[PDB]
Amino acid sequence: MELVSVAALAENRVIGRDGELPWPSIPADKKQYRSRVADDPVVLGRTTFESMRDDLPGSAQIVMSRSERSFSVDTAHRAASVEEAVDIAASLDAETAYVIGGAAIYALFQPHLDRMVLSRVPGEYEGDTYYPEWDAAEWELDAETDHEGFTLQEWVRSASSR
């Protein structure tokens, strides 16, 4: 298919403070992220990647920026656009990819995703890394379910019926 974005967030829709997220990681976060993204390649920022230099996601780790390439693991690589992020994920070996995302990533990828997977986590936070708005004719609800610490949320792009 193509690629699906996977971020976790609270009040003001805050992604996190240090990198991806300000809590360390609950077992439902690192198990839903690993049965979603551990086989599949992930497209992500310098906020989320300056973290994932320690913990890596799946079969590759793509950065949407304009840096020189070459980062830390051999499964870690750099996209210049959405077209360069999809062409590098399909060049390694994959049908779908994912996205942790982003200060810029979810805000640039929103029209180009297969799905917007999200994680609704309580506790209420100050205002550092921000997520985009959600609509009704751009994307519908694929799945809503309860998880350990949060609510899982799967959004699908607009499907034709009548």
UniProtKB/Swiss-Prot annotation:
CDD domains registered for this protein in UniProt: DHFR
Its EC number(s): 1.5.1.3
Activity control, per UniProt: Activity unstable at KCl and NaCl concentrations lower than 2 M and activity increases with increasing concentrations of KCl or NaCl.
This protein's pathway: Cofactor biosynthesis; tetrahydrofolate biosynthesis; 5,6,7,8-tetrahydrofolate from 7,8-dihydrofolate: step 1/1
Domain DHFR: from-to ranges: 2-162
Swiss-Prot/TrEMBL keywords: NADP, One-carbon metabolism, Oxidoreductase
Catalysis performed (reactions): (6S)-5,6,7,8-tetrahydrofolate + NADP(+) = 7,8-dihydrofolate + NADPH + H(+)
Gene3D superfamilies linked: Dihydrofolate Reductase, subunit A (3.40.430.10)
PROSITE patterns in the record: DHFR_1, DHFR_2
InterPro entries attached to this UniProt entry: DHFR, DHFR-like_dom_sf, DHFR_CS, DHFR_dom
Gene Ontology BP term (one): one-carbon metabolic process
Entry binding sites for NADP(+): 8, 14-20, 47-48, 67-68, 101-108
Residues where substrate binds: 29
GO molecular function, one term: NADP binding
Function: Key enzyme in folate metabolism. Catalyzes an essential reaction for de novo glycine and purine synthesis, and for DNA precursor synthesis.
Family membership noted in the UniProt record: Belongs to the dihydrofolate reductase family.
Name the UniProt record assigns to this protein: Dihydrofolate reductase HdrA
Organism per entry: Haloferax volcanii (strain ATCC 29605 / DSM 3757 / JCM 8879 / NBRC 14742 / NCIMB 2012 / VKM B-1768 / DS2) (Halobacterium volcanii)
